Design a protein around this motif. Structure first.
Motif, PDB file in Angstrom:
ATOM      1  N   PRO A 141       0.841  -1.201   0.000  1.00 50.75           N
ATOM      2  CA  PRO A 141       0.000   0.000   0.000  1.00 50.75           C
ATOM      3  C   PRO A 141       0.872   1.245   0.000  1.00 50.75           C
ATOM      4  CG  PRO A 141      -0.570  -1.525   1.805  1.00 50.75           C
ATOM      5  CD  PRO A 141       0.758  -1.932   1.281  1.00 50.75           C
ATOM      6  N   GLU A 142       0.434   2.248  -0.743  1.00 50.80           N
ATOM      7  CA  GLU A 142       1.121   3.527  -0.799  1.00 50.80           C
ATOM      8  C   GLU A 142       0.616   4.404   0.342  1.00 50.80           C
ATOM      9  N   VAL A 143       1.547   4.939   1.138  1.00 50.47           N
ATOM     10  CA  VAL A 143       1.253   5.863   2.242  1.00 50.47           C
ATOM     11  C   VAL A 143       2.013   7.159   1.976  1.00 50.47           C
ATOM     12  CG1 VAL A 143       1.590   6.310   4.710  1.00 50.47           C
ATOM     13  CG2 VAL A 143       0.816   4.046   3.931  1.00 50.47           C
ATOM     14  N   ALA A 144       1.315   8.294   2.075  1.00 50.39           N
ATOM     15  CA  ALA A 144       1.916   9.566   1.677  1.00 50.39           C
ATOM     16  C   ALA A 144       3.126   9.901   2.543  1.00 50.39           C
ATOM     17  CB  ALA A 144       0.873  10.684   1.761  1.00 50.39           C
ATOM     18  N   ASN A 145       2.987   9.733   3.847  1.00 49.82           N
ATOM     19  CA  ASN A 145       3.918  10.278   4.831  1.00 49.82           C
ATOM     20  C   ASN A 145       4.254   9.137   5.773  1.00 49.82           C
ATOM     21  OD1 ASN A 145       4.090  13.286   4.285  1.00 49.82           O
ATOM     22  ND2 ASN A 145       1.860  12.944   4.294  1.00 49.82           N
ATOM     23  N   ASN A 146       5.427   8.532   5.568  1.00 49.85           N
ATOM     24  CA  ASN A 146       5.809   7.381   6.368  1.00 49.85           C
ATOM     25  C   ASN A 146       7.302   7.381   6.647  1.00 49.85           C
ATOM     26  OD1 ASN A 146       4.970   5.180   7.868  1.00 49.85           O
ATOM     27  ND2 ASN A 146       5.239   3.728   6.198  1.00 49.85           N
ATOM     28  N   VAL A 147       7.836   8.532   7.017  1.00 50.50           N
ATOM     29  CA  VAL A 147       9.232   8.659   7.425  1.00 50.50           C
ATOM     30  C   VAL A 147       9.410   8.095   8.823  1.00 50.50           C
ATOM     31  CG1 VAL A 147      10.958  10.393   8.189  1.00 50.50           C
ATOM     32  CG2 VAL A 147       9.781  10.598   5.991  1.00 50.50           C
ATOM     33  N   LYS A 148      10.509   7.402   9.037  1.00 48.61           N
ATOM     34  CA  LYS A 148      10.874   6.889  10.345  1.00 48.61           C
ATOM     35  C   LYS A 148      12.384   6.886  10.441  1.00 48.61           C
ATOM     36  CE  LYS A 148       7.434   3.133   9.633  1.00 48.61           C
ATOM     37  NZ  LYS A 148       6.130   3.497  10.269  1.00 48.61           N
ATOM     38  N   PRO A 149      12.932   6.719  11.638  1.00 42.26           N
ATOM     39  CA  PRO A 149      14.379   6.550  11.779  1.00 42.26           C
ATOM     40  C   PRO A 149      14.917   5.312  11.071  1.00 42.26           C
ATOM     41  CG  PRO A 149      13.469   7.265  13.829  1.00 42.26           C
ATOM     42  CD  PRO A 149      12.297   6.962  12.942  1.00 42.26           C
ATOM     43  N   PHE A 150      16.193   5.409  10.677  1.00 48.49           N
ATOM     44  CA  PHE A 150      16.974   4.283  10.174  1.00 48.49           C
ATOM     45  C   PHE A 150      18.300   4.253  10.931  1.00 48.49           C
ATOM     46  CE2 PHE A 150      20.052   2.164   7.566  1.00 48.49           C
ATOM     47  CZ  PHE A 150      19.369   1.067   7.049  1.00 48.49           C
ATOM     48  N   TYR A 151      18.649   3.085  11.458  1.00 41.43           N
ATOM     49  CA  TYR A 151      19.736   2.937  12.433  1.00 41.43           C
ATOM     50  C   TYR A 151      20.938   2.332  11.722  1.00 41.43           C
ATOM     51  CZ  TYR A 151      16.061   3.962  15.622  1.00 41.43           C
ATOM     52  OH  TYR A 151      15.059   4.630  16.316  1.00 41.43           O
ATOM     53  N   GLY A 152      21.759   3.211  11.138  1.00 40.13           N
ATOM     54  CA  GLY A 152      22.915   2.792  10.391  1.00 40.13           C
ATOM     55  C   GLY A 152      24.036   2.334  11.282  1.00 40.13           C
ATOM     56  N   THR A 153      25.016   1.695  10.636  1.00 39.36           N
ATOM     57  CA  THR A 153      26.096   1.010  11.344  1.00 39.36           C
ATOM     58  C   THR A 153      26.965   1.996  12.108  1.00 39.36           C
ATOM     59  OG1 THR A 153      26.174  -0.870   9.786  1.00 39.36           O
ATOM     60  CG2 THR A 153      28.191  -0.373  10.990  1.00 39.36           C
ATOM     61  N   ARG A 154      27.268   3.127  11.488  1.00 38.90           N
ATOM     62  CA  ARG A 154      28.134   4.138  12.059  1.00 38.90           C
ATOM     63  C   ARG A 154      27.325   5.416  12.218  1.00 38.90           C
ATOM     64  N   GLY A 155      27.438   6.031  13.377  1.00 39.96           N
ATOM     65  CA  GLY A 155      26.881   7.345  13.577  1.00 39.96           C
ATOM     66  C   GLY A 155      25.445   7.339  14.052  1.00 39.96           C
ATOM     67  N   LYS A 156      24.957   8.555  14.251  1.00 39.07           N
ATOM     68  CA  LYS A 156      23.598   8.770  14.686  1.00 39.07           C
ATOM     69  C   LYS A 156      22.604   8.270  13.637  1.00 39.07           C
ATOM     70  N   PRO A 157      21.370   7.968  14.053  1.00 36.72           N
ATOM     71  CA  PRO A 157      20.378   7.468  13.100  1.00 36.72           C
ATOM     72  C   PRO A 157      20.047   8.489  12.027  1.00 36.72           C
ATOM     73  CG  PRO A 157      19.710   7.002  15.351  1.00 36.72           C
ATOM     74  CD  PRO A 157      20.896   7.883  15.446  1.00 36.72           C
ATOM     75  N   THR A 158      19.615   7.989  10.887  1.00 34.51           N
ATOM     76  CA  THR A 158      19.131   8.814   9.797  1.00 34.51           C
ATOM     77  C   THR A 158      17.622   8.634   9.713  1.00 34.51           C
ATOM     78  OG1 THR A 158      19.704   7.016   8.286  1.00 34.51           O
ATOM     79  CG2 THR A 158      21.299   8.802   8.549  1.00 34.51           C
ATOM     80  N   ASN A 159      17.021   9.211   8.685  1.00 29.33           N
ATOM     81  CA  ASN A 159      15.612   9.016   8.401  1.00 29.33           C
ATOM     82  C   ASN A 159      15.457   8.379   7.036  1.00 29.33           C
ATOM     83  OD1 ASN A 159      14.254  10.467  10.727  1.00 29.33           O
ATOM     84  ND2 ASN A 159      15.571  12.124   9.917  1.00 29.33           N
ATOM     85  N   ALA A 160      14.376   7.628   6.870  1.00 31.07           N
ATOM     86  CA  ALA A 160      14.059   6.985   5.602  1.00 31.07           C
ATOM     87  C   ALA A 160      12.553   6.949   5.450  1.00 31.07           C
ATOM     88  CB  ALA A 160      14.620   5.560   5.511  1.00 31.07           C
TER      89      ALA A 160
END
Length: 364
Positions: free
Chosen positions: A175-194
């Motif tokens: 399903p397509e959702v307009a607004n579904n940004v959440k954190p992404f927890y990468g290997t190095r450094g502070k989390p990003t968003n995706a």
């Protein structure tokens, strides 16, 4: 059909995938099967094919008629023109003007390996770069536009270029959702968003204790291709799961998958990845074809060798599939890929590892 029930010939693929991943802290996508086509083209060009002969051996099958029918079968299965998806593997030797290409070699390259050879003048690298980049575009429907600059052709006599293009529709679109940004927890450094997409469905799935990772299968329309995702458990990193992956252990991990209800959350992403393959090939022991003793007497009329090998691939993953923009649409397991993960695309009729990659930072 369902998942592949035979034994994959993926020893080289996994060795090479591991070498690439270990040297990039970014997103990666490549075609391991296409690298084997390139190596086999170089094997066909060597008089040895009746020490270069010895290294190229997890790739050769080692009688030459069996090799050609094998790669030809797997190429035609994967690319088979069909209404459900589009897949093209394109391979070209761009050969300096002074080299006489042997016609029987052009014939086998086109017949069995869906490859070609083209004459350029490297004394005009600006012209040559333009010629190679227009070829890339022509053979990827514009999805890729460039693979070399004049500077990367410096000193070249034969450049071997491979690109791959794929458009596929999920059997089970999200399903397509307009607004579904959440954190992404990468290997190095502070989390990003995706930006994420989520659905519930019935998918082949296992939490592999052996690999320390969840594995998920998302099929494409056409009863041929599927994408596998390997999501390390939170206690584990991509690099630790990778060190556990080999032909036998990946065989068993897929073997253990069965259909289950799964809630699947995946980040959307789009990127391309390009690499000069000389160094990683040498790192995995493929060295003689880059040595002073390398020769290509069955390709070039008599001594010359491949100067540089380049491969590029693009990937776009969204709710509808791979490079897809239109479509037609409680014991639940949770697969929430908000950490780095590994993926691959397989021809499920033959085991072919058509794409492999990893996500370290998904950007769409």
């Amino acid at each position: 059909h369902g998942p592949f029930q035979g034994q994959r010939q993926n020893e080289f693929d996994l060795m090479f995938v591991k070498e690439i991943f270990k040297n990039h802290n970014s997103n990666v996508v490549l075609s391991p099967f296409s690298v084997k086509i390139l190596l086999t083209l170089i094997y066909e060009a060597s008089d040895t094919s009746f020490n270069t002969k010895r290294e190229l051996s997890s790739v050769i099958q080692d009688n030459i008629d069996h090799t050609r029918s094998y790669y030809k079968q797997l190429l035609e299965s994967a690319q088979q023109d069909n209404k459900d998806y589009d897949l093209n593997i394109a391979t070209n030797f761009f050969v300096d003007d002074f080299i006489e290409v042997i016609n029987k070699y052009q014939q086998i390259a086109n017949t069995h390996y869906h490859a070609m050879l083209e004459k350029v003048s490297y004394s005009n690298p600006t012209q040559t770069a333009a010629t190679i980049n227009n070829w890339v575009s022509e053979h990827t429907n514009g999805r890729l536009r460039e693979i070399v600059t004049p500077d990367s052709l410096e000193g070249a006599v034969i450049t071997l270029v491979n690109v791959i293009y794929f458009k596929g529709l999920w059997t089970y679109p999200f399903p397509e959702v307009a607004n579904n940004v959440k954190p992404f927890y990468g290997t190095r450094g502070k989390p990003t968003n995706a930006q994420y997409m989520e659905q519930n469905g019935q998918f082949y799935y296992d939490n592999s204790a052996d690999l320390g990772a969840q594995i998920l299968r998302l099929p494409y329309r056409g009863n041929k291709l599927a994408m596998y995702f390997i999501l390390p458990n939170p206690d584990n990193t991509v690099n630790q799961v990778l060190d556990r992956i080999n032909s036998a252990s990946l065989h068993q991990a897929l073997w253990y998958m069965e259909e289950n209800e799964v809630n699947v959350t995946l980040p959307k992403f789009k990127f391309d990845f390009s690499e000069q393959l000389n160094e990683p090939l040498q790192q995995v022991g493929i060295r003689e074809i880059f040595s002073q003793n390398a020769s290509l007497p069955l390709l070039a009329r008599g001594e010359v060798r491949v100067s540089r090998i380049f491969q590029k691939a693009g990937i776009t993953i969204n709710e509808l599939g791979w490079e897809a923009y239109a479509a037609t649409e409680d014991g639940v397991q949770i697969f929430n890929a908000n950490r780095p993960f590994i993926f691959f695309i397989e021809d499920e009729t033959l085991g072919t590892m058509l794409f492999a990659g990893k996500i370290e930072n998904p950007v769409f």
